[PDB]
Design a protein around this ligand. Sequence first.
Ligand SMILES: Nc1ncnc2c1ncn2[C@@H]1O[C@H](COP(=O)(O)OP(=O)(O)OP(=O)(O)O)[C@@H](O)[C@H]1O
Ligand SMILES: Nc1ncnc2c1ncn2[C@@H]1O[C@H](COP(=O)(O)OP(=O)(O)OP(=O)(O)O)[C@@H](O)[C@H]1O
Ligand SMILES: Nc1ncnc2c1ncn2[C@@H]1O[C@H](COP(=O)(O)OP(=O)(O)OP(=O)(O)O)[C@@H](O)[C@H]1O
Ligand SMILES: Nc1ncnc2c1ncn2[C@@H]1O[C@H](COP(=O)(O)OP(=O)(O)OP(=O)(O)O)[C@@H](O)[C@H]1O
Ligand SMILES: Nc1ncnc2c1ncn2[C@@H]1O[C@H](COP(=O)(O)OP(=O)(O)OP(=O)(O)O)[C@@H](O)[C@H]1O
Ligand SMILES: Nc1ncnc2c1ncn2[C@@H]1O[C@H](COP(=O)(O)OP(=O)(O)OP(=O)(O)O)[C@@H](O)[C@H]1O
Ligand SMILES: Nc1ncnc2c1ncn2[C@@H]1O[C@H](COP(=O)(O)OP(=O)(O)OP(=O)(O)O)[C@@H](O)[C@H]1O
Ligand SMILES: O=P(O)(O)OC[C@H]1O[C@](O)(COP(=O)(O)O)[C@@H](O)[C@@H]1O
Ligand SMILES: O=P(O)(O)OC[C@H]1O[C@](O)(COP(=O)(O)O)[C@@H](O)[C@@H]1O
Ligand SMILES: O=P(O)(O)OC[C@H]1O[C@](O)(COP(=O)(O)O)[C@@H](O)[C@@H]1O
Ligand SMILES: [Mg+2]
Ligand SMILES: [Mg+2]
Lengths: 223, 761, 761
Amino acid sequence: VQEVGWHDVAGWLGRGGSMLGTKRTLPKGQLESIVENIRIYGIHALLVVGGFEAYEGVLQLVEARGRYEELCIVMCVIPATISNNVPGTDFSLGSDTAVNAAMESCDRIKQSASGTKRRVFIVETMGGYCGYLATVTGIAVGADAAYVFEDPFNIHDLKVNVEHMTEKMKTDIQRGLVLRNEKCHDYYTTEFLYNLYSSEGKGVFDCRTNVLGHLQQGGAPTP
Amino acid sequence: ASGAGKAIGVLTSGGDAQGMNAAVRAVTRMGIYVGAKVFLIYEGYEGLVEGGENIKQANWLSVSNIIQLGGTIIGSARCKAFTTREGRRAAAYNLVQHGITNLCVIGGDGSLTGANIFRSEWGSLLEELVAEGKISETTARTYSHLNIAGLVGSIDNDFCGTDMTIGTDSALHRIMEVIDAITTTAQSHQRTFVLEVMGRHCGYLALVSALASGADWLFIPEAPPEDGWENFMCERLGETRSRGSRLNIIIIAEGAIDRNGKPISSSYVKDLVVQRLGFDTRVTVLGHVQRGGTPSAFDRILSSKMGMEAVMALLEATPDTPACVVTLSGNQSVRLPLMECVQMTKEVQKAMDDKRFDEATQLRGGSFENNWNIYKLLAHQKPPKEKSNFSLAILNVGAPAAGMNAAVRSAVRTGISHGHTVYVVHDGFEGLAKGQVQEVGWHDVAGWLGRGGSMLGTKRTLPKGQLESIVENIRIYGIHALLVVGGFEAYEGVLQLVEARGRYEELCIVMCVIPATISNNVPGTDFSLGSDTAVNAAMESCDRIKQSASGTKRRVFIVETMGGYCGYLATVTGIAVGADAAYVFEDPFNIHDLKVNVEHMTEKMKTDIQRGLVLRNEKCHDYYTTEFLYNLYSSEGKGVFDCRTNVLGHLQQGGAPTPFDRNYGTKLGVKAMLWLSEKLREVYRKGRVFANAPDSACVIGLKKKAVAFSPVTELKKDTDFEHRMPREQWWLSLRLMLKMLAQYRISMAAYVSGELEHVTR
Amino acid sequence: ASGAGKAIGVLTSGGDAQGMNAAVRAVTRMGIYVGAKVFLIYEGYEGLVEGGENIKQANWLSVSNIIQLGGTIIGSARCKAFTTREGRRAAAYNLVQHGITNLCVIGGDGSLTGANIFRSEWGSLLEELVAEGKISETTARTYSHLNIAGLVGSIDNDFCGTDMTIGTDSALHRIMEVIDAITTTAQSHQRTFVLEVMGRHCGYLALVSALASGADWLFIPEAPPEDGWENFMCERLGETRSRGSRLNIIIIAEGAIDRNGKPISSSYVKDLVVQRLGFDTRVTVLGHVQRGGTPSAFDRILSSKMGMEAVMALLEATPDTPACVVTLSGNQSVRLPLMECVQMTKEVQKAMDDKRFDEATQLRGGSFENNWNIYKLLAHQKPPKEKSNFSLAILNVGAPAAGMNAAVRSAVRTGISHGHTVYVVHDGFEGLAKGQVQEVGWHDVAGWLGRGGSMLGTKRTLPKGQLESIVENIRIYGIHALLVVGGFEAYEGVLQLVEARGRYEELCIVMCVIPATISNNVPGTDFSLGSDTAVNAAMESCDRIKQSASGTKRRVFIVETMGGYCGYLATVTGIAVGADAAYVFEDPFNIHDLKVNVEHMTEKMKTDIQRGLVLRNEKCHDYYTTEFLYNLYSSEGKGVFDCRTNVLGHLQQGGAPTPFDRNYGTKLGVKAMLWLSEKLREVYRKGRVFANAPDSACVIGLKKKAVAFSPVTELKKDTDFEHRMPREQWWLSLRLMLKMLAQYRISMAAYVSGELEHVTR
Ligand SMILES: Nc1ncnc2c1ncn2[C@@H]1O[C@H](COP(=O)(O)OP(=O)(O)OP(=O)(O)O)[C@@H](O)[C@H]1O
Ligand SMILES: Nc1ncnc2c1ncn2[C@@H]1O[C@H](COP(=O)(O)OP(=O)(O)OP(=O)(O)O)[C@@H](O)[C@H]1O
Ligand SMILES: Nc1ncnc2c1ncn2[C@@H]1O[C@H](COP(=O)(O)OP(=O)(O)OP(=O)(O)O)[C@@H](O)[C@H]1O
Ligand SMILES: Nc1ncnc2c1ncn2[C@@H]1O[C@H](COP(=O)(O)OP(=O)(O)OP(=O)(O)O)[C@@H](O)[C@H]1O
Ligand SMILES: Nc1ncnc2c1ncn2[C@@H]1O[C@H](COP(=O)(O)OP(=O)(O)OP(=O)(O)O)[C@@H](O)[C@H]1O
Ligand SMILES: Nc1ncnc2c1ncn2[C@@H]1O[C@H](COP(=O)(O)OP(=O)(O)OP(=O)(O)O)[C@@H](O)[C@H]1O
Ligand SMILES: Nc1ncnc2c1ncn2[C@@H]1O[C@H](COP(=O)(O)OP(=O)(O)OP(=O)(O)O)[C@@H](O)[C@H]1O
Ligand SMILES: O=P(O)(O)OC[C@H]1O[C@](O)(COP(=O)(O)O)[C@@H](O)[C@@H]1O
Ligand SMILES: O=P(O)(O)OC[C@H]1O[C@](O)(COP(=O)(O)O)[C@@H](O)[C@@H]1O
Ligand SMILES: O=P(O)(O)OC[C@H]1O[C@](O)(COP(=O)(O)O)[C@@H](O)[C@@H]1O
Ligand SMILES: [Mg+2]
Ligand SMILES: [Mg+2]
């Protein structure tokens, strides 16, 4: 714990990531150390800027108020995560940056055929089980499909989408793009969809794959 | 051999050209790699004067994680004290107090002029210093000679002896990012975009920007406009409107003047256009934006190379050799004496001061005059009253590469200018067999500069299968020359058509290969058209990935790059991003080398540096795939760092061309057409073109120093067709620089540095 | 410590018990590992007598690729010369010519009797040899003591002091393969299968075969049938028919006799059955088939262990210690003096010659008498006039394991014999919660011995979730005891019920866990029921996989075995198959170890051995997966050997139980039911059963020497619940033998060998 001043945060606006360290560890395991440090430093309020782990940890401290008197302090959670998976808000802080980075990657990928070859790209986005990032990114890029956990899909839906893509690909449009959330399906992975689209699209289109890993993460924040 | 027992000083002065940090990093790390002590002089000549706290010895971690930063972490300052001997003597004192007999100065023309005057007076300054009693006679006989290696760090490119300077490419990246904001939009209404660049003294940035953007008009101080240009410009914009072209671009340098000394302001040109044309005219002034942003890939590689060569030149320099500037003319490293470059800079300044003003542009360098002539030729269609019966077909073969369109545009305009009947064939050899030949005009290539990929279709299919169809279509369309813009497939196909001259009379036509591919695997060139774009997109993704760990988690990223078996893209990207290791096919590695690198990474990761980055070429190893390296690094790094993987697929492919690629493809497209026309006249006989010698089918080069024409049959010896790459690649020496910058103790006796060369008049 | 400067002779004599080659391999490779010279004596005592060419020094490759071969590469012969002193003196001479003061004899009872008489006369033979002038007095004071370490290699198991001999398990594999050919077929008509085994002197093979097959009747020389057995047998077959049982199995040893000396021929029993019953009776005589085939997994492991221990016992043996026989009683290695074992063999032979004939069966060993009592109890339902209010439920929990059905069959019969009300619950704890409880009878488990998998369903679901349903069903059905046959889930579930006794009074019931799993990962035992089957299936696949490269081709196979985090299956399979390495979780390995082992394999593959084999436990490493090891071995072996991968999935799972697994599950199921009955009588008080102490919930063991009962609460300390295995496993010392037998220089100072023990009367 370090007391901070006005100028200690100077120029923190445009810096992505976290000047302060981030850890995912929830407070329940080391709760005795947390209450001790709160007592030592006289912390009367707590402003937790973070993702679902921030919200869950603050929930754990609230439920542990009954055991520890010191945890009866005002707490506030600022939802800050790429996935936009934090309950209580519509836009987690930094989801917009991730969406912008994801579409820029998808726009570059969709431009990589350059109007000659007709090709479908399976782009895999992050976000855990939360599909928000995939779906909005699919809207922004005109993706044909955005497979997400919240909309469970089976092989019948996949055949419908693949036939739809094949029919579209015979028309004037030549660059297809289907997004897949990393945890949308247990078995129909990105490799599965690559095999499916490339097999069924034989003689019509080629298929390629690009797993956007931390390309959606480390960018500077959008305005 | 090693420079042990001697100390090197590195300073930056003048405008903070982005890429200075790359040069400082390479200078520092090479200096302490060869055992010398490196001293960082903060604020340039300022801290040289005051000294004391401003001079600190560097360690390896002092220049850690700065290569992607623009500006200069050392800092730069304008000081008038170094102008006068009072402060220059204090500078010499502070250098002697640290035993710094070796100085690397990274700065513009004024910086290097000050360094030249500082060497020229170093003996006199030491004499006056010992005379005044601030240093004993002993300790002054040593340090009697000061070694100066200059690096031109500036966006102006005003230093006459040098062709390319650090930060010029990145300033061009900023400029073209702004211009692409305008041009890539769906142009909706008639508007005029007037761009003002800071080229107050030198108009090189204004010129290359105009060439890269296809500006309608250019105001540069080197060639002021003729009297009555007001009407001439307004009429040019008028017919531009009548064509239906909805956007006019006016690039006005800050130093824009008329034939007299009166400057032309951007606001004046704005109000002029508004008054006579009524177009929505708004002036965009970049200002500080040109010096801003990250350094481009080119700037990082070239700054690192020149910083290393500066240090090496600084150790092999005896008392007799003069102050030098380490620079690259073309792709070749070279050292030029500081005195001659300063003298040429003074001559051009005097010439520009209304002495030999019309003949000052030639003394600026042949590149400037050639660039301005190419710009004017491509800008406005002059009437080609000359005509020739020749006709030529432009092919795009292989993968798409950023900058093919720029080459095709220049080829079309230049060929039309020479009166040739220019055709474009869609889909390369497929269309040539299928007769997809389309006669092209001047305006059919309008706005092709900034478009990435290929506007003509690209196909990889070699011509051998459909050779009867290709010769039939050459006969039908009367094709006398064949311009093939593409990758290894382009070269290989031209090689097949040349070999088939033995069988088919119709293939006895002049052929030219413009190497255009991401992999840079085309023999006969150093830079395939669009390799620069791929490198820039590759580092930007790698920089994003390296920034994602956010300064706290210790993480290594395995980043898999494209390039086939050709490792060029992987290695240069590793240099640009400070990758720990760039595994490539041309440097075979076994598990012993992997354990060496992994233990090296673990040791590095226990220190202050927390973000590791290893690159893997997609086809470097049969078994040690990206997943293999992931498993290795994550297991051995257990309890120290985590490992992640990212296969940069076609992220490296579909980008718009970088400004280098546009200008490069523009120029060699012009040169290819010049060479085609000259070879066609040389070969026209008895009423027909009959080109059968092997020198009538060449790959346009840029092989070491200038553009070359290597015959494909001669290149076949040095071509590995199985791996689709040349057998001897110029860039393998850059592995040593990568490994040295990553603390790998590699005996780099195989690295060759540029030797001294006098200025070319 | 090492036995350098001394030579070890190894010979084989008597019937060629399969697994002899494994013992010879281990003796040889230990003797040259410790620096001793190993001399192979061909044809046994024959080549001992003639000597000369028949005595050859062994190298490492002398025993290469022999462990899977039955018989003996050394060769055995019957020689009468060793009976007489004329040839025995020549044998002592030939040993002295090579300086072989140490002899390991692998043979049957006659072989070891000859070895005993040879040691007893070694001093006298040397005295007479120097007296006759064939050796000087010097060179005879050295070698004055001959060290003998015996190994019982025979299918008879006639050596009384020893419980298990090399080749007994494999002879049983042959016998049961023949019986399973009959029983697994859809039995269509009433037929009688009379199997004649070669147990001419010892009826142990006949007995254990009958126990494993559930023979209707048994003729063994140890217990000849009573007078009037003709009618009693024919009636037993008669009620067998009346039951609808369509196959009768009569195991008649070659040495089958009546109470007089008249032998009972298989043809007589055939004609007897034909005359009174009319069943299709055919006599199967195995003859040489018993000694044939590959050695079983058990035979290879135990032969390797005993051969290693024979060498070690031979180096730590001073002039005073007597000749010993290295054997295992239970799972514990032990050394027994040769003289006492020979004396016991003579006593039992005299007893069997109508001296103490009714009391000869006990002197054969308690295991024989216990096996015969278990056989007779399970064979025919005698009327249980005793009754008890106790009722017990039999569960199958975890994965299916070969031999669960045998255990359940024996538990059912033994419980019915003791008057208990035996329930079986289908699907384990799921059924107990769901009330899938079905009372079972004697004939409901008929023919469950040879059935693989689990007749009762198995489920992995632990009882904590549905504990209310379990206690409810225990109350409804009045279940006073719980017999849980299964893997780690069985032990963990019984532990959960024991821990929940404090909450629920009904759970205070006597519980017993029979460890039955493939992984052998259950704490409290050395061998889980069905681990032997998995090991045997694993080696058979590995032998096939090793057999597949042929002739010139040098190839390594990475075989992945199951077993979870428990490495037992991988390591024993590696010993059985001569695997170079068995990567397991309990022996953590990094890339340094992998490079060592890969270079080791490469150097081996440059020698004349061409088929390497390494095993990988499925969960040995998080990152160095089977694909990783495939990539590593194939890359480093480039130009030396090829690499291939085979993941033995459920090939190790579904096989029918081996004869060991059948007999083991039979015996411990009986023993578990005996222990349950004793505990339930000791705990019945106040008119109800109340089992609250920790001792009432035990895992039946066989932990070192004999069967044990470890309380589950006490075993909780030595259980790694995250990895589902015990913390201290007995078999980690076998890694040292594996690595030693693969030329890995591993200091096995942590290995403990069995010490001298006198015979148990
Ligand atoms: N994106 C960035 N990444 C890293 N460092 C940065 C970034 N932006 C600014 N900085 C650094 O932060 C320092 C803080 O000074 P800065 O001028 O940028 O903010 P400030 O105007 O003084 O404070 P304030 O936010 O209240 O306006 C700068 O010197 C600069 O080096
Ligand atoms: N003739 C000279 N003698 C001594 N010192 C000089 C001379 N010219 C310039 N300097 C020193 O070099 C410093 C920077 O030089 P300058 O003003 O020309 O910028 P620059 O190097 O040319 O970079 P840029 O062109 O981009 O603006 C000056 O502040 C001055 O201290
Ligand atoms: N795109 C342009 N940008 C700037 N100036 C231009 C451009 N085109 C023509 N000019 C200027 O207009 C003047 C006359 O143009 P024009 O080409 O029609 O006649 P010219 O005799 O051929 O001149 P020159 O050959 O020397 O370039 C030239 O001096 C030139 O500097
Ligand atoms: N990145 C781009 N992608 C697609 N179309 C583009 C791009 N840039 C410009 N264009 C299109 O090219 C068209 C031609 O006009 P453009 O301004 O680009 O060139 P021009 O000035 O008329 O002739 P020139 O290329 O010789 O300079 C424009 O209308 C515009 O729609
Ligand atoms: N009492 C004995 N004294 C000396 N040598 C003996 C004696 N018994 C057996 N041998 C020797 O050991 C050799 C093998 O013995 P034997 O024929 O009896 O078979 P075994 O050792 O008992 O094993 P198995 O019966 O299974 O084949 C014989 O050839 C004989 O030379
Ligand atoms: N399955 C069997 N195989 C071989 N012998 C058997 C079998 N069953 C019974 N016998 C033998 O037949 C004899 C009489 O059998 P039975 O069990 O019915 O009467 P018993 O008085 O109880 O004899 P015992 O209990 O000692 O074996 C016994 O000596 C027994 O050894
Ligand atoms: N591996 C097997 N798989 C399936 N059924 C089997 C297998 N082995 C035996 N059986 C069946 O068990 C049935 C019961 O008769 P079986 O001959 O096998 O023994 P049993 O006399 O009835 O009882 P006991 O266990 O005492 O020997 C047979 O009809 C046979 O079909
Ligand atoms: O845990 P959050 O809040 O969902 O953070 C999102 C990020 O974490 C991730 O799970 C990836 O984290 P890691 O790189 O450490 O494996 C992605 O979903 C995303 O990049
Ligand atoms: O074959 P070239 O001329 O090197 O083309 C470069 C491109 O081709 C590649 O091999 C991959 O192309 P594809 O995705 O179409 O299969 C990469 O090296 C790179 O993206
Ligand atoms: O849980 P256990 O007792 O270790 O059973 C071993 C078997 O379970 C396994 O995990 C596989 O089980 P499944 O086939 O059902 O997935 C293997 O380790 C092995 O075949
Ligand atoms: Mg300047
Ligand atoms: Mg015998």
